[PDB]
Design a protein around this ligand. Structure first.
Ligand SMILES: [Ca+2]
Ligand SMILES: [Ca+2]
Ligand SMILES: [Cl-]
Ligand SMILES: [Cl-]
Ligand SMILES: [Zn+2]
Length: 422
């Protein structure tokens, strides 16, 4: 047994004093006060805010295949430091989780290494080559969270359609990185003012939106739950809004960097600012923010995308796409929108807990009695500077280094086991 003394919890739209008694994997009670019994491990929260653990539906753990970038150990250690207790890693690994053999090998690595709950995505097709559908019921039975189009995969509407029919059969989401291959044009950032100023090839908004517009109609015909990954363009948001209005089961996520930065924030040819989808225009960001606020975009997800230092030191035209984000997500968003803007702590917490869970019909995201002891303790009032030295991730490829932030996690617990202590 464990007891978290002195924390504050959210009730409606206010912080309130409450102690939390934990029995094994579950929490036994949440009470104004509670005296300890026998063999009680003590955690003193010291007045800090106690939140349900964050849930990240889009991370890259890199292992297997890319262990030098990140491992399941380092990646979930980074998640816990960011206050996340559940993450769902993408399938763009080697081997791809596209078979029972590969899923079982992965679950073993998770059992041995994961420091938080890991709900892995399956690919939609064998090796993500987009030529042959995986065995959907077989992967669901091995713990597949969703079936996901990441990388250069599904290349015809027919394959996406057939993939969606299979996911509808197993009551699982098709999750898609919307990117039309012929419309990438070798681009490395948003096609707009800045790409022209820097002489760097850009990616047009249409690369993303046209796939969303196709998939929502394929989803509607298949009767399946379609989820759009990290939305970046103003037109994508429109298409999702129109699709939801038509009664289609589409949901969508936005990343912290797309809420906070635009093409204008890119100081020069710097791959630290290179991710996919790219940081787009002020008009695009305004659309995303509007869409998250009116519910068109369901939740926030990080697209934590660790890469090695020498890789991200190269010019944008050569460097891989991606920035890390598990450790910086909440503090950045809390400081910008809550401490320094209109959002409430409750509103921010919901985008990271209950909303991801409602989207995928998950049981987590709440701080309730009988729920798992999935918690993070966060220091709301002290300022910390974001430094690569502090990252538990193996990587430090992020434009947020140097930012001064409030709302920093100091302790994360997964099923009653302290998994991070700052
Ligand atoms: Ca050029
Ligand atoms: Ca590190
Ligand atoms: Cl959780
Ligand atoms: Cl795929
Ligand atoms: Zn991604």
């Amino acid at each position: 047994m464990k007891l978290i003394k002195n924390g504050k919890v959210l009730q409606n739209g206010e912080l309130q004093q409450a102690d939390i008694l934990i029995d094994g994997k579950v929490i036994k009670q949440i009470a104004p006060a509670i005296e300890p019994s026998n063999g009680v491990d003590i955690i003193d929260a010291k007045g800090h805010f106690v939140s349900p653990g964050f849930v990240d539906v889009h991370v890259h753990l890199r292992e297997p295949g890319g262990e030098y970038k990140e491992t399941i150990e380092t990646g979930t250690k980074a998640a816990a430091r960011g206050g996340f207790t559940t993450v769902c890693p993408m399938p763009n690994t080697r081997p791809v989780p596209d078979s029972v053999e590969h899923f079982e090998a992965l679950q073993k690595l998770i059992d041995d290494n994961a420091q938080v709950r890991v709900l892995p995505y399956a690919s939609i097709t064998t090796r993500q080559l987009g030529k042959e559908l995986v065995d959907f019921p077989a992967l669901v039975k091995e713990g597949a969270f969703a079936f996901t189009d990441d990388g250069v995969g599904v290349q015809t509407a027919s394959m996406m359609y057939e993939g969606m029919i299979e996911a509808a059969k197993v009551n699982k989401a098709i999750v898609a990185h919307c990117e039309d291959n012929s419309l990438i044009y070798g681009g490395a950032m948003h096609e707009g003012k800045r790409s022209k100023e820097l002489g760097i090839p850009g990616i047009p908004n249409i690369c993303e939106s046209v796939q969303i517009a196709r998939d929502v109609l394929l989803a509607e015909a298949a009767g399946c739950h379609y989820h759009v990954c990290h939305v970046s363009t103003k037109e994508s948001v429109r298409v999702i809004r129109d699709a939801k209005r038509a009664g289609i089961h589409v949901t969508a996520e936005v990343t912290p960097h797309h809420l906070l930065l635009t093409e204008d924030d890119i100081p020069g040819n710097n791959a630290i600012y290179k991710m996919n989808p790219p940081l787009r225009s002020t008009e695009d960001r305004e659309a995303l923010l509007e869409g998250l606020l009116d519910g068109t975009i369901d939740c926030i997800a990080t697209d934590h995308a660790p890469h090695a230092r020498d890789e991200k030191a190269q010019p944008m035209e050569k460097a891989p796409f991606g920035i890390v984000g598990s450790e910086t997500a909440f503090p950045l968003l809390y400081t910008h929108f809550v401490k320094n803007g209109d959002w409430t702590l409750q509103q921010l917490v919901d985008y990271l807990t209950i909303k991801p869970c409602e989207t995928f019909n998950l049981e987590y995201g709440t701080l309730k009695e009988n729920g798992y002891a999935d918690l993070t303790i966060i220091d709301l009032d002290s300022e910390q500077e974001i430094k690569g030295e502090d990252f538990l991730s193996k990587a430090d490829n992020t434009p947020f280094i140097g930012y001064k932030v409030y709302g920093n996690p100091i302790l994360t617990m997964v099923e009653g086991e302290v998994k991070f202590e700052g």
